[PDB]
Amino acid sequence: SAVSIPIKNAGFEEPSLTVEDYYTIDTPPGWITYDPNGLVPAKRTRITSNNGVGYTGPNSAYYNHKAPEGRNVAYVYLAQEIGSGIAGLEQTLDAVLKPNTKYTLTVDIGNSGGSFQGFPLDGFPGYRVELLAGDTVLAADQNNLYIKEKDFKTTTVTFIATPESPYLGQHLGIRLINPLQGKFSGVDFDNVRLTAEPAE
């Protein structure tokens, strides 16, 4: 029997947004911008690399169906050329890595489609989802799921920490990454969940 690990703003439902297709351009509350190649400015515009939340409802321009969870999805957009690097959202959790524990990290990934002000949203930069302890990537999935235009799909990253793990006691983390491997170079995320259960 699997226990949920608390995540802040796990569904990006904060801040609440009023109108369909509206969005913020500030880091979703409870999350941090992961920007190892310095592609995302502190003060963003609508044409810079940016991240935030977007109201995706039953009549979204960008997806067939509403947000997998609630009304909002998170998004990560990189303006720069392909190969310029990677960026995304990260959150350090209160839970620490425990031995003999199977961790299950699920998140829905969106390939926004259609168009914004005449600009085609066709194409996708890919995704990479990472479970961390300290500053170590313990386990990751990059692009194992194909995601159609205007669609979302759930991925699962799993990891088992042994008593021998050098990372026990270190704070867990979750990273949601735009690897900038295609244009249009926007990727969306929703419904982040992490569970712990006993393993052998």
Ligand X SMILES: CN1CCC/C1=C1\C=Nc2ccccc21
For residue 101, the tally of other CB atoms under 10 A from its CB is: 19
Distance separating alpha carbons of residues 113 and 121, to the nearest angstrom: 5
Picked from ligand X, Mg ion, Ca ion, none, the partner binding residue 35 (CB below 5 to 8 A depending on kind) is Mg ion
Binding mask 46-75 for Ca ion (x = CB under 5 A): ---------------------x-xx-x---
Length of the chain equals 200
**Phi and psi at residue 116, to the nearest 5°:** -125, 120
| Closest C-alpha to 121, from 132, 113, 111 | 113
Question: Residue 199's Cα: distance from chain center in Å?
Answer: 26
Please enumerate in sequence order all residues whose Cβ is within 8 A of that of 170, keeping only pairs 6 or more positions apart, or say none.
Answer: 96, 97, 133, 134, 136
User: Which range in 30-38, 47-55, 90-98, 172-180 contacts ligand X by CB under 6 A?
Assistant: 47-55
126 annotated as ligand-binding:
no
Determine the residue type at 80: Q
Q: Which is nearer to Mg ion, 40 or 107 (CB)?
A: 40
Task: By CB under 8 A, tell whether 146 contacts a second copy.
Answer: yes
User: Which range in 46-54, 122-130, 161-169, 170-178 contacts ligand X by CB under 6 A?
Assistant: 46-54
Closest approach of ligand X to the CB of residue 157, in Å: 22
Binding positions for Ca ion, 134-193, rule CB under 5 A: 190
Task: By CB under 8 A, tell whether 124 contacts a second copy.
Answer: yes
Task: By CB under 6 A, tell whether 159 contacts ligand X.
Answer: no
The answer, yes or no, to whether the previous bond of 6 is cis (omega within 30 of 0) is no
Mark the binding-site residues for Mg(2+), compressed into ranges: 35, 40
Give me the residues that bind a second copy (CB under 8 A), please. 82-83, 102, 122-124, 126, 128, 136-146, 157-160, 162, 164-167, 181-183, 199
